[PDB]
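Assess this one:
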Amino acid sequence: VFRQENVDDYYDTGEELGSGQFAVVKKCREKSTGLQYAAKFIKKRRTKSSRRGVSREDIEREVSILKEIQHPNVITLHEVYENKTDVILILELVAGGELFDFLAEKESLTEEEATEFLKQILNGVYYLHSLQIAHFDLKPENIMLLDRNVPKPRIKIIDFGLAHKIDFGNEFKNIFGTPEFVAPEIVNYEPLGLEADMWSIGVITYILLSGASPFLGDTKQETLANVSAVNYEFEDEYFSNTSALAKDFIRRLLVKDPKKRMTIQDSLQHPWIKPKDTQQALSRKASAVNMEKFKKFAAR
């Protein structure tokens, strides 16, 4: 059971900010404080038999995950309402748009500058994993900015509709997510855990440095074969001004066996992320993101 009052008693709701299949997001303003939020209206599935709406079980999972988390790089739940047909999540307002679109507006980006945005994603996932929460849905459109018009912008990780508590005593298996971004164990209906987020971080980093999707094929089913076999390459047309350390980073994340894939702790320590000496910090300032190609990717 959630707040029963009419959301309109405490909030002035405004214009639409987007819409998944089962949700509408509007801008809103809390009457008692004048602060701005965003109200996500999730459609309740009313009859078990129905394909429309979201089950109570899926909403309660999202909400109790969201209630549980408090960190500068993940989105904050303010408050939760419900009525006959919806569950209404009052969420923090993330106004800066997708990180990839903002990066596409620069004249260039060194591997050094890129690592500073990526450190923010790494910190968010670090916090999550330390609470045994797997996001299960990391992809660029879920990496946002609080505010784009400031010196050093803050990354916000959004969208917990797929997130789960990993419980030590029981396998979790499922197929879900976007084919280009999901790990092999997801594709193959094998046991899942925190390692899937690590594979998605690999896919994101690859795209950030090159503007190419590592596993994207000509049809959905080709993309899945690509993922499952770990069929990827660093082709020179894309990666020829990309350092050895960045390549090694991606390679330790894009790995079929999840027990052998890098952990979140391991990756905060990797020498691409934390240089150990002058040669390593040099060649990271010296290396550039492939900007011409990258811009094209955020353009599609």
